[PDB]
Amino acid sequence: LLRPLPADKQIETGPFLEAVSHLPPFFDCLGSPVFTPIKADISGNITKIKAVYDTNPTKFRTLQNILEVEKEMYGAEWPKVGATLALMWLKRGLRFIQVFLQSICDGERDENHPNLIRVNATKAYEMALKKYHGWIVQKIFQAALYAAPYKSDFLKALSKGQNVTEEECLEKVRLFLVNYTATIDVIYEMYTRMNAELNYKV
């Protein structure tokens, strides 16, 4: 579980990185090397932010501090720089996971293929990432789509710490999603507020 959102909405950088660093392992249980480009990217961005944070944990105590400090540091180059840029991309990967898990938890599915998760992944992709990807990168994500595991296999990979029903697994995901969604929401709101959001395509 992520930390509760402080009432002032200031996300502590350390505990944030700690929490999100638990996410990339879940990719390794999707049953294909076709997810390693996606995992490497999310892990890559967590590593970049931690790197900046570790240089001055006090100065970078909160995510907002990162943006404020780097803006001061890099001037006109900001926000296309440093941990700000890493977190701009990270939040999109985190949002993908959020939408994807929420979609599954909400019972959204293709009635023709109730044991696939392609509709959930496509939805998450369209909502979180697609607008920032050119066709080269989109092909990489479509490959991940057709390699996506069966829903039953995925939910076993989330649980199967053993003796947990699929409904109980979904209950635990629903709980995780509460603070996770709020955190991601606040990060997006901050990027917009601070004019840190860039819309270039990769």
UniProtKB/Swiss-Prot annotation:
Beta-D-galactosyl-(1->4)-beta-D-glucosyl-(1<->1)-N-[(9Z)-octadecenoyl]-sphing-4-enine binds at D41, I42, S43, G44, N45, I46, T47, K48, H133, Y200. Detected in brain, kidney, spleen, lung, cerebellum, liver and heart. Gene3D superfamilies: Glycolipid transfer protein (1.10.3520.10). Residues 38-59 are annotated as: 2 X 12 AA approximate tandem repeats. GO terms for molecular function: ceramide 1-phosphate binding; ceramide 1-phosphate transfer activity; glycolipid binding; lipid binding; lipid transfer activity. The keyword Transport applies. One of its GO terms (biological process) is ceramide transport. It is found in: Cytoplasm. Belongs to the GLTP family. Accelerates the intermembrane transfer of various glycolipids. Catalyzes the transfer of various glycosphingolipids between membranes but does not catalyze the transfer of phospholipids. May be involved in the intracellular translocation of glucosylceramides. This is Glycolipid transfer protein. It comes from Bos taurus. The lineage of its organism: Eukaryota, Metazoa, Chordata, Craniata, Vertebrata.
